[PDB]
Amino acid sequence: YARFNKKIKMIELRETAYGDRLCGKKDGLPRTIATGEWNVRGSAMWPAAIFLYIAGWIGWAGRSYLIRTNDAAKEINIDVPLAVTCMASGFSWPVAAWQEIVNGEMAVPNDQIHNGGPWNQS
């Protein structure tokens, strides 16, 4: 009974919290705004920004670890101190990644990696 009272309170809190959120005039289900509004309830801009930051953080930490451990032995037996060092260092990815992009340290010319299968010779 007490747990159901807590559930009822949660439901009423959800009702009062979604009041400012927009819902269709026929469904009643609140909508998510994906127009880049930045200033409406249920907008997708804030979750997009947060996720993009943390996802770039994850990718940058992984790339940094792979660059600093250029060995297969370091991928099965993780160098945990270096791994956590890269994980902590990944916070500055939006600046470091761009500084590597413009300074020619992220991309590699196509003539240095395997392009793909041959399509001609004769």
| Contact residues for other proteins, defined by CB under 8 A | 3, 6-7, 10, 13-15, 17-18, 28-30, 41-42, 46-47, 62-63, 66-67, 70-80, 83, 105-108, 110, 113-120
Q: Dihedral of the CA atoms 22, 24, 29, 30 (nearest 10)?
A: -20
Single residue of 18, 33, 41, 63 touching ligand CLA by CB under 6 A: 63
Q: Are 33 and 42 in contact (CB under 8 A)?
A: yes
* Closest to 22 in 3D by CA, of 4, 35, 9: 35
CA distance 38 to 27: 24
Query: Whole-number minimum distance, CB 99 to other proteins, in Å?
Result: 14
> Of 2-10, 18-26, 55-63, 105-113, which part binds ligand CLA (CB under 6 A)?
55-63
Binding to ligand CLA by CB under 6 A, coded x per residue (else -) over 64-103, reads -xx-----------x----x--xx----------------
**SS3 of residue 27 by DSSP:** coil
